[PDB]
């Protein structure tokens, strides 16, 4: 009697505790059903998969520089001195059943985590979800992005590899020693000595499996709690206002679709871990200061920092008996990048004057200057990433390596400007298109007038039509406009039988008019609620 068991368990729960009101509030919480609001969930799900795979990895990983000869199964690396970290990474790859798959899905989850964090940041920035109520949310999310970047750095640096080791040597060691007053001291504190200090990988292992994941988990908890209680913002729409949330309740629909989305994201990541090879360390010999490779790139989320290193033009200053190497330039650049990213909402409000409580998102077209600035920043980030990749770009796409370096150097001040101008004008022209639709109706096929030979596109008005043909223009309300009669009530009733065979006409008619009734009922309910809010 599962129904009786459920009832008895509910009564016992509500007697021991009293979660009825709280649970009802959680279940009844309404979440907007916009697709772009799942971008953060992608990052959350990738993070969960990262935790689950990282536990498995830690069950088999040994962090240490203790030198050992492999003497494993992988023949191409036998008798070669390597760190125990590399040896156990190879053991995960080969000796452990499914260890290669687990580590590959872990790395793919890391890449998807960074990518989805970037996409979510783009969504919120361009939609203006950081304004008065949620600047703190933006700030903690920026800290979260920085932590994710650096944890991925430490994660692919954990198995001491040739690629990851040379990346560490460059970024960490060089840029740390570069810092003027405390650079060498920071280097010695972090590595416990010179660069190959025998505590580096244990320290990174701790930072990567316990410390940084703990901070990220706490910050994700704060992030999700803030989103939960500062009810999720929404785009302007029929019944959507600054003081309501139009969407679906948590329990019946949102919970089911979020769980299913998590399942599908897990499936995508597992499929990638299977079919796509990620970081094949066995091809990469154990780290040695002398051995190198041509590629020498970090993961894509640090590729922009590496590209900054490459592109910045070797400007070194030599104060009285001292040196200020080119690494400090990039250190300051990264500092500026993070500072501006964290402080943008406050910069935005200082610049514009907006101190209003904003609960309705802005369309990126509707906010041109911010959209232009975001496009400019994305262009700069892409230029830096492809500058880091300039080695492989030059190799495959036959471009001189010097040519790619200087393309990056010039474009990091030219391409941002071009993209800013283009994005600003593009946003304004999207606004112009929206107003054209508002004032003339949707466009359709052309018709030749009866008496004379005029051609008229035979538009379709979206609002009340004047006594004559031309309609009364509507007022823009911040919501997208249907520019195709495709997406309106036109040409949308295929035979509802099946792909290969029809259904009885009675069934088809019943279904089609039932759907018509349901959709017009939804439209009428939204219209009535909209009229009720002010009217």
């Amino acid at each position: 009697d599962f129904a009786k068991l459920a009832a008895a368990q509910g009564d016992a729960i509500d007697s021991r505790y009293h979660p009825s009101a709280a649970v009802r509030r959680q279940l009844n919480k309404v979440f907007p059903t916009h697709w772009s609001f799942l971008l953060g969930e992608i990052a959350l799900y990738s993070f969960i998969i990262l935790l689950l795979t990282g536990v498995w990895l830690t069950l088999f990983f040994d962090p240490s520089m203790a030198h050992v000869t492999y003497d494993g199964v992988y023949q191409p690396l036998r008798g070669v001195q390597m760190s125990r970290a590399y040896e156990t990474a190879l053991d995960i790859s080969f000796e452990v059943r499914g260890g290669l798959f687990v580590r590959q899905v872990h790395h793919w989850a890391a890449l998807m985590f960074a990518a989805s964090i970037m996409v979510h940041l783009a969504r919120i920035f361009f939609t203006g979800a950081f304004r008065r109520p949620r600047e703190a949310n933006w700030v903690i999310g920026s800290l979260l992005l920085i932590l994710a970047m650096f944890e991925g750095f430490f994660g692919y640096s954990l198995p001491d590899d040739l690629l990851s080791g040379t990346g560490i040597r460059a970024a960490l060691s060089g840029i740390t020693m570069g810092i003027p007053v405390i650079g060498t001291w920071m280097h010695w504190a972090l590595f416990g000595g010179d660069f190959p200090g025998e505590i580096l990988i244990p320290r990174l292992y701790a930072l990567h499996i316990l410390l940084i994941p703990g901070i990220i988990l706490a910050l994700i908890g704060a992030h999700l709690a803030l989103v939960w209680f500062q009810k999720h913002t929404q785009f302007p729409g029929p019944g959507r206002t600054e003081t309501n949330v139009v969407g679906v309740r948590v329990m019946p629909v949102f919970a089911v679709k979020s769980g299913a989305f998590f399942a599908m994201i897990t499936g995508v990541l597992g499929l990638m871990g299977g079919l796509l090879t990620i970081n094949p360390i066995w091809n990469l010999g154990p780290y040695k200061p002398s051995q190198v490779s041509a590629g020498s790139q970090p993961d894509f989320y640090m590729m922009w920092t590496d590209g900054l290193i490459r592109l910045w033009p070797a400007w070194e200053f030599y104060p009285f008996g001292h040196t200020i190497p080119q690494g400090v330039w990039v250190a300051v650049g990264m500092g500026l990048v993070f500072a501006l990213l964290i402080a943008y909402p406050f910069i935005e409000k200082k610049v514009t004057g907006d101190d209003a409580h904003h609960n309705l998102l802005q369309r990126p077209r509707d906010v041109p200057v911010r959209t232009a600035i975001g496009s400019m920043a994305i262009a700069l980030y892409l230029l830096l990433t492809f500058a880091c990749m300039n080695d492989i770009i030059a190799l495959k796409f036959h471009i001189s390596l010097n040519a790619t370096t200087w393309i990056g150097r010039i474009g990091m001040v030219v391409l941002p400007a071009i993209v800013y101008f283009v994005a600003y004008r593009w946003a304004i022209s999207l606004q112009r298109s929206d107003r054209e639709v508002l004032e003339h109706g949707v466009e359709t096929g052309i018709i030749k007038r009866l008496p004379h030979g005029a051609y008229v596109e035979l538009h379709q008005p979206l609002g009340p039509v004047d006594e004559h043909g031309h309609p009364i223009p509507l007022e823009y309300a911040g919501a997208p406009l249907p520019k195709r009669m495709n997406k309106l009530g036109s040409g949308g009733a295929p035979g509802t039988g099946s792909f290969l065979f029809p259904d009885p006409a009675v069934e088809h008619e019943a279904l089609t008019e039932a759907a018509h009734a349901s959709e017009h009922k939804s439209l009428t309910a939204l219209k009535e609620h909209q009229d009720r809010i002010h009217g």
Partner: protein
């Protein structure tokens, strides 16, 4: 002898199948990041567009 060993390694690395799926060229970070951003992120974003709504 050393040159023969290097030749053997070159041939082995050239003819060795990629363990753990399609080997995206041989360059790790750049092909892997591109494959993420295309395959994984287009899949995720398209699935999000399917599940959610446009408005």
């Amino acid at each position: 002898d050393e040159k023969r060993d290097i030749v053997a390694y070159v041939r082995e690395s050239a003819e060795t199948p990629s363990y753990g799926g399609y080997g995206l060229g041989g360059f790790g970070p750049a092909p892997e990041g591109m494959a993420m951003w295309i395959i994984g992120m287009v899949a995720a974003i398209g699935v999000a567009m399917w599940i959610g709504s446009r408005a």
